[PDB]
Design an enzyme around this catalytic site. Structure first.
Site, PDB file in Angstrom:
ATOM      1  CB  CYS A  81      -8.131 -20.585 -24.274  1.00  0.00           C
ATOM      2  SG  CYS A  81      -7.258 -20.837 -22.738  1.00  0.00           S
ATOM      3  N   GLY A  82     -10.747 -22.670 -22.930  1.00  0.00           N
ATOM      4  CA  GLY A  82     -11.828 -22.725 -21.970  1.00  0.00           C
ATOM      5  C   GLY A  82     -11.433 -22.193 -20.603  1.00  0.00           C
ATOM      6  CG  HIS A  83      -7.400 -22.349 -18.584  1.00  0.00           C
ATOM      7  ND1 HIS A  83      -6.717 -22.535 -19.764  1.00  0.00           N
ATOM      8  CD2 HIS A  83      -6.705 -21.418 -17.888  1.00  0.00           C
ATOM      9  CE1 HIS A  83      -5.661 -21.747 -19.787  1.00  0.00           C
ATOM     10  NE2 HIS A  83      -5.634 -21.057 -18.661  1.00  0.00           N
ATOM     11  CB  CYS A  93      -8.224 -29.491 -21.033  1.00  0.00           C
ATOM     12  SG  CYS A  93      -7.806 -28.912 -22.690  1.00  0.00           S
ATOM     13  N   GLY A  94     -10.811 -26.986 -20.981  1.00  0.00           N
ATOM     14  CA  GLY A  94     -12.154 -26.680 -21.452  1.00  0.00           C
ATOM     15  C   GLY A  94     -12.391 -27.120 -22.882  1.00  0.00           C
ATOM     16  CB  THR A  95     -10.594 -26.452 -26.084  1.00  0.00           C
ATOM     17  OG1 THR A  95      -9.232 -26.562 -25.652  1.00  0.00           O
ATOM     18  CG2 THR A  95     -11.000 -24.984 -26.170  1.00  0.00           C
TER      19      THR A  95
END
Ligand SMILES: [Cl-]
Ligand SMILES: [Cl-]
Ligand code: NA
Ligand code: NA
EC number: 5.1.1.8
Lengths: 314, 314
Positions: free
Chosen positions: B93-95, B241-243
């Site tokens: 989960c990037g964020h 959305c980081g991923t």
């Protein structure tokens, strides 16, 4: 005494039959020393970003109802309150008054007994029972019109009552919908269409009052009735709706279907329950709603000066 | 030392470009001493009610993403984390990693510099910059298939890429939709239909992996691209959305459209922005995502033993 560059809003969250109340204990701007209605006008006109910061994403959700604690005008009152939701400001709020009163007990500010609470639509009398349930003796409720015909766009004709219970309601039994927690998407769509229909038809409460709550009633083998209630911001009420149940009792009373003092047990779409009764009054009825609230969080909201979404995402 | 009959969950909420992260500091059950993946399995199987209490109404909302702080297996890591949302458990989960790392600084647990964070899909390397922005060097990202034809029920044919960025994504540019914050209802409906289409078609990631995130890309005069991203529980990501951006870079890299080290600036549907770049690796790319998080609340969730909705409304 904190000096970092952010505002702190102290809140205590509760829910009443699943419907949330976010009690703001401190951190909003001064709104003057007038009536709760006058303070609501200042808040809405000058400081609405405080509502959105508390209620809207990222800190809130479209479901939440907030309650701002205020010093009351009368020293005989326990508190004043202004209620708000994702779209704007409410009048009275039954589930929220139950939450506020239960929360004030947790804060150590009141004990069991009778407590007057000032609101923008008048003062209500809340009794905190020894069991920590709360009875709210609401403002006057009355029916404005009965069996009003409405062609619901996309669905077809219905009949509804228009009634005031501290907010304006359209109350329908012949909607043809299935009132159940697993069906809230379809119920939300239907009730939203009802409201579009009222707008198109120019149908209002007294003095052109906007009918911004919709109630769909159904029989229930365990209770007197079960309802689905759409609120002004198009979220539904998880509770039986205190003001909406008040409005329902005004209709029942006027139709000779519920006697003064008799108890009516109203369930919500998710199965929570309020007990209600009324007495006759000049021009309507005075209904009392009893229910329970549970604490769900203690928090400090942080509104950072450099956060582009500090006031919420709009 | 509190003895009242309720559980207390200590949390710190932040948001990253408007996308919330609820960091659980304490209060969840023991999950053993295995890998974050093994702990996630225990949490999901035995203690999923802790997720629902934190994420779902009344205390949360369908938008929220949670992050459970864990003691990592390796003493060289700053933390382990398990991420979850309204429907279940995420991979990376990037964020959320940006939020966690910013929050750990606020807690006084880390300073600027490089910090390893264990997750159920492997260890990532987060750099907390002196400006308190965070770069997350993600796990390996790769494209599984390109220009996959899909008849979207209710809408018509599209082509999309299938790619892994720490979760599985379907990435579409030729969707014919208007990617803008005022259009999220229609975008949500479209992306939900895309996912129904993938299911019907039996289209998956590697080893039958469920494609549970949908990304709709558009040109943007201010950035390299703007996206709308539908998450597994059918809420959308307020962040870039980081991923999902990691997955996008795997596609760009494979198509020769972005060189190693070059910066890609990805906007979300509401206008927040991440900066991304990658390096080549065996079997894919290693992307790094940089963004900012802001604190939004400090809270203790209260889970009262006698509250029928203590574990959330399901
Ligand atoms: Cl501020
Ligand atoms: Cl409990
Ligand atoms: Na009945
Ligand atoms: Na551009």
């Amino acid at each position: 005494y904190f000096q970092s560059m952010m505002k702190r809003i102290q809140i205590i969250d509760s829910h009443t039959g699943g419907e949330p109340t976010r009690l703001v204990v401190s951190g909003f701007p001064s709104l003057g020393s007038g009536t709760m209605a006058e303070r609501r006008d200042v808040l809405a006109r000058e400081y609405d970003r405080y509502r959105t910061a508390c209620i809207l994403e990222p800190r809130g959700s479209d479901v939440l109802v907030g309650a701002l604690l205020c010093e009351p005008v009368s020293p005989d009152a326990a508190a004043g309150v202004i209620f708000f939701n994702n779209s704007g400001y409410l009048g009275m709020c039954g589930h929220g008054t139950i939450g506020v009163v239960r929360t004030l007990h947790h804060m150590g500010r009141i004990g069991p007994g009778v407590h007057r609470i000032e609101t923008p639509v008048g003062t209500v009398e809340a009794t905190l029972h020894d069991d920590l349930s709360v009875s709210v003796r609401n403002v006057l409720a009355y029916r404005h019109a009965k069996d009003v015909a409405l062609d619901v766009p996309g669905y077809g004709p219905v009949r509804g009552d228009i009634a005031w219970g501290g907010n304006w309601f359209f109350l329908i039994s012949d909607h043809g919908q299935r009132v159940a927690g697993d069906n809230v998407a379809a119920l939300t769509a239907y009730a939203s269409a009802v409201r579009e229909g009222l707008e198109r038809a120019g149908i209002t409460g007294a003095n052109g009052g906007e009918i911004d709550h919709i109630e769909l009633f159904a029989d229930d083998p365990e209770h007197d009735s079960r309802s689905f209630v759409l609120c002004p911001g198009l979220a539904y009420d998880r509770s039986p709706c205190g003001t909406g149940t008040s409005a329902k009792l005004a209709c029942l009373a006027a139709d000779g279907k519920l006697a003064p003092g008799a108890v009516w047990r109203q369930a919500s779409v998710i199965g929570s329950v309020f007990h209600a009764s009324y007495v006759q009054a000049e021009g309507g009825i005075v209904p009392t709603i009893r229910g329970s609230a549970h604490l769900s969080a203690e928090a400090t909201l942080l509104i950072e000066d450099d956060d582009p979404f500090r006031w919420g995402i709009v």
